[PDB]
Amino acid sequence: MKHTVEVMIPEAEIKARIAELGRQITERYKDSGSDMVLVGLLRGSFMFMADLCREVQVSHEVDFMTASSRDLKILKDLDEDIRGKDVLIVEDIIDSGNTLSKVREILSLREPKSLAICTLLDKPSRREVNVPVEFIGFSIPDEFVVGYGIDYAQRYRHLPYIGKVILLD
Amino acid sequence: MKHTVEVMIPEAEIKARIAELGRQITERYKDSGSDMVLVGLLRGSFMFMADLCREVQVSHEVDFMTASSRDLKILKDLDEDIRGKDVLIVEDIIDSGNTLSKVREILSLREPKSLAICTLLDKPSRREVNVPVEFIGFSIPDEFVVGYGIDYAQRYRHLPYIGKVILLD
Amino acid sequence: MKHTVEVMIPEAEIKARIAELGRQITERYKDSGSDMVLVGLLRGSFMFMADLCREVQVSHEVDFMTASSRDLKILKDLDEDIRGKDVLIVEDIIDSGNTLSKVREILSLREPKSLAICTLLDKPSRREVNVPVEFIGFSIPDEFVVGYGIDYAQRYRHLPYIGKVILLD
Amino acid sequence: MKHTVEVMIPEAEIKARIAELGRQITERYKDSGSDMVLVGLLRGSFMFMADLCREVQVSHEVDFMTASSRDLKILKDLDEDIRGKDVLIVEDIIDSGNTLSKVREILSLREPKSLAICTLLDKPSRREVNVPVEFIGFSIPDEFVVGYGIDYAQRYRHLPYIGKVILLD
Ligand SMILES: O=c1[nH]cnc2c1ncn2[C@@H]1O[C@H](COP(=O)(O)O)[C@@H](O)[C@H]1O
Ligand SMILES: O=c1[nH]cnc2c1ncn2[C@@H]1O[C@H](COP(=O)(O)O)[C@@H](O)[C@H]1O
To answer: Any idea which positions bind GMP (chains A, B, C, D)?
Structure first.
């Protein structure tokens, strides 16, 4: 467990990609006319949600939810209703796609006007369950990453950039 | 809010009906062979659960879940995994069928081997949604019942019998 | 893990002790005049709570709560308030006394009129944290018990009696 | 309910104040040596948390907790253990001091190495309970503020600045 962390994706770059995601999300929803709510998955999405929602130029609500990353259970459900609203699930990263997949199903049952997912990172190679992912900040190989909500031994979660854990020998 | 409570279903009557329900549920699942779990919906069904599981002659586990009743949110999810298991949802009362209908959808997503519902009381005259109910203790008229876990303004759950509030008397 | 279960405390005896606990609890509170609420710890106390509350002859509420049996956390808090009320925590068994001890502290902060604990079983020898326990159904040595809410490998939780797990070789 | 929103604290002003708070908190805990954890109180403080932890130059973990505000109930407890750790409760706003006062009592029970509070906004003119607040971003007049995580009828949390609702205008 002896190691070091080096910057992989500088915060300045993360900020740029998010602003763009924001324009994209805004453009995609600005004319819906229905209520919108960004749904972040805890703990991972807190930082990403913070920045992202500020880049979304349409009036919207911000709610969080926390699932158990065998059965995907709900430790903390949404505080507000989503029925008839536009819901954009926000996660820091998708790899296997299991939790995201199940969470999308659960929310689907509440009959929202629509459902989409926006992740800061995407690890295509690790996918195990195909699930739609409308907005992605970065596509990366299966690297040992941390920061921006992603931890390693309850650490680096507060880093302003995405770094890679170099596992010293 | 001034009111009276009259007996609707005496304790002995309930005790007998539950023994029967027990035999029936037992007969149904005795030859399944996969794990079985009864899921009571807090708060109202804790008493019915306590008595019912004691009449179920097949080895099972007991878990609980608490749900809201606009969107149906999970205030307390199961501690157990139900995937590939016979699941018997234990409810105290079904009238409109909204909440149960949804709770059932949510568990269905976890892919249990089988999914059924067992309710103590049933007000068919109140049904708004078609929902499969495999076991019913009593089909009753549209009375405001209390006791045996059920309440009236956080009151009467401890009554050993199902009673009906009269009011203005 | 190969074993068998033999009856240690017959349900008929459990029922008798509970009726007596009920008289004792009733006598102790009947003149308070304040609101009363029995607080059961999930999953363990569901069955005991069911029977016990029926033996308590004073008007009271029934709420449940579930803690994490290193830090004692609250997975599901009470649905109702206890401030200014008489609160009787109900558990199936106390051994180390850790969870019970912490739960009593947490509820204490809400300033209830009073706080007491009632357990069906007590394992004095295993105590690690001294905490008051006003009502006990049975005092037993450190036996491998199951039933009446107490499980073993998600099993025997529904047994109507307290049995001892004979660990066959 | 007809209203207007005016800027009260511009985004740049907040950004600068947080950098300062960051230096201060860093200076305070840099030589402690035990694990440290910032606990944000959902929902209102997710944004302040996101920005604050990035200015804290000491290795820490980030966790969240959601509480009610008559009795103070835990709707979502921490995922981490705080025993023997420096704990920095991260709040968005403190006015009466009731909720924080209680949340602090609850965590205090888990025996952390140290326990402090850091709030972005403060309405001293609204204080009803004496509660220790170690770090404050801004002491403000009694205005109904929104933005930067804070809301008005589930609205405005995404604003990058603290604004004040005007109403009937
Ligand atoms: O007579 C009643 N008094 C109090 N609550 C009731 C009564 N009938 C139904 N409920 C509530 O409605 C729920 C069942 O709703 P359903 O599944 O939508 O039919 C129960 O779990 C109860 O909490
Ligand atoms: O101006 C306001 N608008 C909306 N909610 C507020 C406002 N001021 C305080 N609150 C709520 O009150 C809580 C703080 O209460 P305290 O800790 O009891 O002082 C915050 O977490 C908010 O949820």
So the answer is: 91, 95-100, 123, 151
